[PDB]
Ligand SMILES: C#Cc1c(F)ccc2cccc(-c3ncc4c(N5CCN(C(=O)CCO)CC5)nc(OC[C@@]56CCCN5C[C@H](F)C6)nc4c3F)c12
């Protein structure tokens with residue numbers, strides 16, 4: 001089948017692991033060990049094509065070695081996650097895009113911006129603000145909830161679609 005290497009990045013506690021496990025195992029996990037970095041795979045049909053998603057749920061220490069660079073560089077698309085009730089996680093997005101562009105050595109990298117925890121009442125990041133930033137980046141923006149599963153498939157499948165477009169260009 002066709003393989004897609006997805007990488008999930010973003011500040012600690014934005015819901016990277018919860019989103020990944022929601023997509024793979026269809027249930028909400030709270031208090032998942034924040035230090036554990038793992039790859040999860042799933043076979044799915046997206047727009048008529050059988051895909052093998054290979055999803056890197058990033059964690060561990062913030063380290064910039066040639067090795068780590070090389071590892072990140074094998075990612076084909078990046079899910080850039082912030083939490084809508086954490087403004088700092090949103091302003092961290094610039095930094096992750098910067099690192100992704102650096103190791104991919106390109107301004108054109110399949111990416112999707114994700115505003116997670118849209119189930120919460122205490123929003124601090126306007127939907128419109130994230131939409132506009134995403135538009136400046138030239139990428140899709142989706143609001144998700146790993147807790148309720150709202151738009152979780154949308155987010156990941158949108159990234160697959162972006163990688164697919166990149167491959168055909
Ligand atoms: C992420 C990422 C990343 C890419 F997306 C692309 C290429 C990369 C190349 C080298 C390194 C990274 C990368 N590594 C991890 C990273 C990481 N981790 C990993 C996961 N963490 C936890 O899960 C908490 C408990 O452990 C802690 C912080 N954190 C950051 O940014 C964190 C901040 C806060 C303090 C300073 N630092 C710079 C900004 F200000 C935000 N970047 C990472 C990075 F770019 C790349």
Ligand SMILES: Nc1nc2c(ncn2[C@@H]2O[C@H](COP(=O)(O)OP(=O)(O)O)[C@@H](O)[C@H]2O)c(=O)[nH]1
Pocket residue numbers: 010011012013014015016017018019029030031032033034116117118119120144145146147148
């Ligand atoms: N209400 C709500 N809480 C969430 C959501 N996603 C994650 N969380 C909680 O936020 C905390 C951090 O989630 P986690 O997936 O470990 O974040 P990570 O550090 O980015 O991997 C956990 O307690 C989760 O239960 C969400 O969509 N809604």
Ligand SMILES: [Mg+2]
Pocket residue numbers: 016017018032033034035036058059
């Ligand atoms: Mg985690």
